[PDB]
Amino acid sequence: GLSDGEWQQVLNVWGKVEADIAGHGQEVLIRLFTGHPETLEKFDKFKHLKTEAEMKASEDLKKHGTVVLTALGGILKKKGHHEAELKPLAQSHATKHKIPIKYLEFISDAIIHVLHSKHPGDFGADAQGAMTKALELFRNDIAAKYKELGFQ
Numbered sequence: 376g377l378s379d380g381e382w383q384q385v386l387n388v389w390g391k392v393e394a395d396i397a398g399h400g401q402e403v404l405i406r407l408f409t410g411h412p413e414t415l416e417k418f419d420k421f422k423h424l425k426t427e428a429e430m431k432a433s434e435d436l437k438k439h440g441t442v443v444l445t446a447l448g449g450i451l452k453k454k455g456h457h458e459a460e461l462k463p464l465a466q467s468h469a470t471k472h473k474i475p476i477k478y479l480e481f482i483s484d485a486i487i488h489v490l491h492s493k494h495p496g497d498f499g500a501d502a503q504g505a506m507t508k509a510l511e512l513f514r515n516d517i518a519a520k521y522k523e524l525g526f527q
């Protein structure tokens with residue numbers, strides 16, 4: 376549950392992402408894959424990437440970063456009223472991709488890391504607080520659907 380002022384902060388931060396969605400999406404995925412190499416194993420189309428230089432040179436990885444961040448932005452713009460947008464992603468991630476909730480925690484923290492790395496000094500404590508709460512709400516609502524499905 377976020378206040379109106381907290382949502383305003385989230386959507387202000389998101390404007391930074393929308394100015395370069397592919398660059399942010401690429402770096403989020405690279406932070407996830409290099410920090411948590413077990414996550415790469417869930418992607419048949421990226422498991423061939425051995426080095427970060429290959430990851431950085433991969434245009435398909437940047438393309439997938441755009442898909443991921445476009446979906447998250449659509450959810451965030453609903454300001455919590457995201458049941459219809461979130462349900463298919465919870466279902467595909469539990470039943471087809473088999474993504475444990477832990478990996479959604481990993482990517483949430485990676486988003487925070489990338490925002491500080493690309494906007495140092497311009498991602499304030501209030502903005503971090505609100506973005507973190509928004510990602511927690513997203514993860515928590517996914518977790519509820521995972522429990523419904525019995526997925527661990």
Ligand code: HEM
Nearest residue numbers: 414417418420442443446447463464467472474478479482
């Ligand atoms: C911000 C969180 C995330 C968002 C919004 C997101 C969004 C999406 C979207 C829109 C798709 C394509 C449609 C679909 O299959 O449902 C996708 C595919 C996928 N997601 Fe996620 N995802 C997230 C986190 C993750 C994480 C943490 C992993 C694994 C560590 C992951 C693994 C996958 C895989 C394996 C695919 C299929 C890729 C393919 O082979 O083309 N996702 N995701």
